[PDB]
Amino acid sequence: MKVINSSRKVQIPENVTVDVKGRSVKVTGPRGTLSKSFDHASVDINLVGKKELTVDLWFGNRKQIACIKTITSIIENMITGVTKGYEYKMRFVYAHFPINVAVTDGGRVVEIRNFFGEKIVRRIELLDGITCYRNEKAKDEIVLTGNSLELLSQSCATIQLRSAIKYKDVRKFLDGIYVSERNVLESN
Amino acid sequence: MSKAQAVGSNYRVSLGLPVGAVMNSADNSGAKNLYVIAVKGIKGRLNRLPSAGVGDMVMATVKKGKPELRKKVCTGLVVRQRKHWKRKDGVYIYFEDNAGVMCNPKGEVKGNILGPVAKECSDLWPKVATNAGTIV
């Protein structure tokens, strides 16, 4: 009926900092100052020491408690990002009409020229805080690195979606951009 | 059917008459008349004849001609509309009397086209252009 919730928590090492002034948090580290907001299902959170961070909740549902974990997870992810960047190494595939993707960083946009004979550009603006390099082996692989897991990943997904055909079979063309390795973290 | 226009459709529709109008065959094949059933591409609306082409393909019949060619529908090609039109040009082509030819369903005219043929029609249907020495 009411089954009583409790606090999960997250550990913050001594190359990174955290503020939280009004149930909204900005973790900071060597990469940058990555931010995400909370308080929205009456979700109470408080910092105890420069080492722990805790999200307290002791009166609610299963539903309420579900939120608590998620928030914690998100903050952990953010922390990780701030320590060292989330990497999304995609790989594309075609050589009948070789898939040709180009980019600008700073403006942070990716554009797809040739794609299943598409003579258009498919420009897609990446969110802020996403870089893109590419040690290509045989006209394959783009990488997108970024700090906020949540945003970089989203951007990647968008890109993937853009490299897709909406008509005819999917076992016909097995081509487009495809994320080979997500949840990857560079060695610092 | 067929269909191949053009580039463009050589602009607007004009007719001599819609459905139920005789025009001569203008053809070495022994069709002597061509009477319209309807016109191709006419999608049409409530109460409105399927109206004659400027140089476009029609569902037609040999009403008075060879008995072999008589009965049985036939895709044709309008060649000259008695009733007039302006072109993207500022001229008003107008003719003696309506005329066309019986044709193949890839547009192709059978023998040789008799008399004068509006240039639009020729442009539309390359076979027509080929098979005549009058394209005015």
Binding site: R91, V93, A138, D140, Q160, V170, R171, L174, D175, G176, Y178, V179, S180 | -
Partner: protein, 52 residues
């Protein structure tokens, strides 16, 4: 490469489970339609596989 990439491609599209109501491609080890209109059916074909 092409085998290592085709598999990947399949994973993102062809090897997920459809519904027998909404036909909605869930995910490779799915168990309910996850829709309101369906009523999370719990009836799930795996989406077909072909060599052509």
């Amino acid at each position: 490469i092409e085998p290592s990439l085709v598999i990947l491609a399949r994973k993102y599209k062809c090897d997920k489970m459809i519904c027998r109501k909404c036909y909605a491609r869930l995910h490779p080890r799915a168990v309910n339609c996850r829709k309101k209109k369906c009523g999370h059916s719990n009836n799930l074909r795996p989406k077909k596989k072909l060599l052509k």
